[PDB]
């Protein structure tokens, strides 16, 4: 029984509704971006931000770092909590710690927060669960409004985390400002996500064409796209057990290029103008060695032969759209191997 | 005969270490680097290490010395990403370019940009007179001799040794309570002990890596960094799809990839996470993994596959990596 075969598929379809909830929750009656000013005051006074997370939340943090530096103008580092807690590095004078955690209870993040609290530094938690430990023990909380995630592989939590980071960063920019109307840009993103979801059949076909028999897969991108590559590789591993790995395009030369054989699927993201030719060059190099290339590009950057072309959205927001293609391709790869998916 | 130059270069590492120890000391037996270099490093507010591949891995190891000994916050960046997406910089940044050849394209491109911006630079290279040396404010040489093998080995250990020396000298400008030259001699002797145990490294290869299409190298903190370099070595010479992971992150999909017989090479050289990484090993063993635990004297437990000699906690990479290089070499030999 049930409209969707799996919770994960339902949750992917819910992403546009999550974006709409975020857009409504983080604006005022006049339609301006709105976050509690005390949060903004601490964020804008920090000399450095340390994002503390793991897994999919760590990957969202990578995307968010771009907004925090390029819009908010605050130097930002992203760390794996299990590492940070056992080897805390030298800290800046006025650091702010941002704990990204869907549940709000992630153990290693909680241990880090105990320590940064002991040290007297300020903290912000981004979470889906109000009144979770990470919320209660941090100075400030931003809520995701994603609703409960039942599937083990996160989908809507990732896009919600990024969206919230973008809003926080633009409001801080204003205090000191990206020449964009972010709410308008996020509505564009919503509509783009819908377009990908409505192209589910094409995503199923891509899975069939590229991922039916392989034991491995390589997800490659540069810059903003390298971050998303990591997440697509995680999704495909989590649910299909394909040994998927994400690489920066310019790093393939070190060991990985050797691994290419005739038929090896390489999923390449090309959503960034400055590295469009570069990442396509990397694809030509893996193709010469036998790879089967699945290029996912963006309107304005696409070339003959690309496998799929996502709608045009703002250069730093492309992860919100490209990831949905990767989620659905991963879902269908798993489905075709008759796996549980939701776990 | 098989991969002649890799095995040759592995065996050169003691000699390289002894050359570095000689070149970086004076006739008084004190550490010696040019004072201008020391002044620039000691005055920097942050160091940005710019590297790729094995030198990026060496950078990760060196960050620990630069922070913990020299007291300067340090970031390590992949050059090909940095050059197309340069991040926000500190007020007094120093750039450290690690490159064996001194000609690495992406690193060169970043140096051009940092020089345009007027920031200080230091190059760590094996080739004097290379572009990265000529265009940087300062150069430190590696004394490693020529590199011919496809899979790099002696570069990594030379780079870490020089990073340790630079860091301790800076620390003294204001100093870790160790005798670094003495600790590097201990490291040299430990490396010799591993190389003398080549037959054991070959057996480890037979026992774990003969048939697999993949391998997982895991570690925490200092050992996570070395796990990345061991995965790279195995991939480069054997073509097995090796990956390195932090022990505490396996719960994210990667544990999904464990089957009966999957080899997991686990490093345990760090006191504070010894119990933690051993817990992570249990977790993968529960799912079928075949565990190769490489630990260090003082931290070993019954059942460990190999125990390396005791050296300083931050220097352990210099020794542990040699085990991984040799294991990788022999896996490749056997499979060919």
XYZ file of C-alpha atoms in Angstrom, chain A residues 48 50 53-56 58 65-66 68-70 73-77 79-83 85-92 107-108 215-218 221-224 226 234 237-239 241-245 247-251 253-256 258-259 274-275 278 343, chain B residues 46 48 51-54 56 63-64 66-68 71-75 77-81 83-90 104-106 213-216 219-222 224 232 235-236 238-243 245-249 251-254 256-257 272-273 276:
130
model
C 35.768 32.684 11.367
C 33.745 26.362 11.900
C 29.050 17.929 10.761
C 29.236 14.443 9.226
C 28.111 12.568 6.180
C 25.397 14.298 4.190
C 29.151 17.701 6.080
C 30.777 27.576 2.938
C 30.550 29.095 -0.492
C 29.226 32.238 3.978
C 32.492 33.376 2.404
C 31.284 34.920 -0.891
C 32.365 37.574 3.890
C 33.339 35.344 6.830
C 36.182 32.801 6.416
C 34.684 29.356 6.807
C 36.112 25.867 7.519
C 35.120 19.724 9.612
C 34.109 16.144 10.283
C 32.995 16.012 13.881
C 34.583 12.607 14.720
C 37.958 14.070 13.687
C 36.701 16.208 18.649
C 39.904 14.148 18.914
C 42.195 16.643 17.256
C 40.841 20.122 17.663
C 42.940 22.565 15.666
C 44.159 26.045 16.509
C 41.183 28.409 16.725
C 40.606 32.035 15.741
C 26.870 12.140 19.162
C 30.191 13.410 17.870
C 30.583 -2.559 -9.342
C 31.856 1.023 -9.221
C 31.241 4.594 -10.370
C 33.090 7.856 -10.347
C 33.189 17.880 -10.815
C 35.152 21.002 -10.136
C 34.592 23.660 -7.489
C 30.841 23.942 -6.549
C 33.018 18.770 -6.680
C 27.459 8.921 -0.933
C 26.841 3.871 -2.122
C 24.350 4.149 0.731
C 21.520 2.540 -1.229
C 26.244 -0.699 -2.716
C 28.047 0.402 -5.889
C 31.537 1.514 -4.787
C 30.943 5.064 -5.810
C 33.607 7.699 -5.238
C 36.782 13.192 -7.177
C 37.785 16.718 -7.988
C 38.267 16.907 -11.788
C 41.809 18.194 -11.609
C 42.876 15.407 -9.208
C 45.569 12.324 -12.639
C 46.703 10.900 -9.237
C 45.896 7.230 -9.387
C 42.300 7.281 -10.307
C 44.513 4.372 -14.124
C 41.356 2.738 -12.745
C 34.769 29.052 -15.173
C 35.521 25.327 -15.045
C 38.204 22.191 -17.670
C 16.505 0.522 5.194
C 48.083 31.695 8.707
C 48.073 27.986 3.181
C 49.695 20.869 -3.181
C 48.335 17.866 -5.047
C 48.370 14.113 -4.673
C 51.071 12.752 -2.505
C 48.814 17.191 -0.502
C 49.852 20.900 9.254
C 50.116 19.124 12.601
C 52.984 23.872 11.895
C 50.077 24.219 14.305
C 51.263 22.231 17.301
C 51.785 27.746 16.561
C 50.553 29.057 13.213
C 47.021 28.129 11.961
C 47.437 26.065 8.801
C 45.146 25.054 5.926
C 44.427 22.899 -0.227
C 44.261 20.977 -3.406
C 45.875 23.264 -6.031
C 43.490 22.514 -8.917
C 40.536 23.588 -6.734
C 43.222 28.119 -8.432
C 39.648 28.193 -9.786
C 38.006 29.094 -6.482
C 40.359 31.041 -4.268
C 38.974 31.488 -0.824
C 39.018 34.401 1.551
C 42.546 35.029 2.837
C 43.946 36.217 6.085
C 53.378 21.214 -10.981
C 51.071 23.201 -13.245
C 48.185 24.061 -10.927
C 38.886 -5.538 -6.378
C 38.939 -3.082 -3.459
C 40.483 -2.162 -0.124
C 39.757 0.188 2.664
C 42.625 5.572 10.681
C 41.829 8.460 12.991
C 43.564 11.843 13.336
C 47.243 11.482 12.290
C 43.584 9.120 8.819
C 46.856 6.266 -3.171
C 45.743 2.426 -6.445
C 48.760 3.761 -8.354
C 48.046 -2.297 -8.315
C 44.958 -0.586 -9.732
C 42.782 -2.013 -6.779
C 40.068 0.515 -5.936
C 41.516 1.545 -2.617
C 40.028 4.306 -0.474
C 38.458 6.875 5.414
C 38.378 8.328 8.865
C 37.378 5.552 11.222
C 34.490 7.467 12.703
C 32.861 8.147 9.347
C 28.762 4.555 9.343
C 27.892 6.695 6.162
C 27.370 4.257 3.435
C 30.885 2.934 3.424
C 27.386 -0.785 3.369
C 30.248 -1.831 1.099
C 43.894 9.072 22.292
C 42.042 7.264 19.464
C 38.197 4.365 19.124
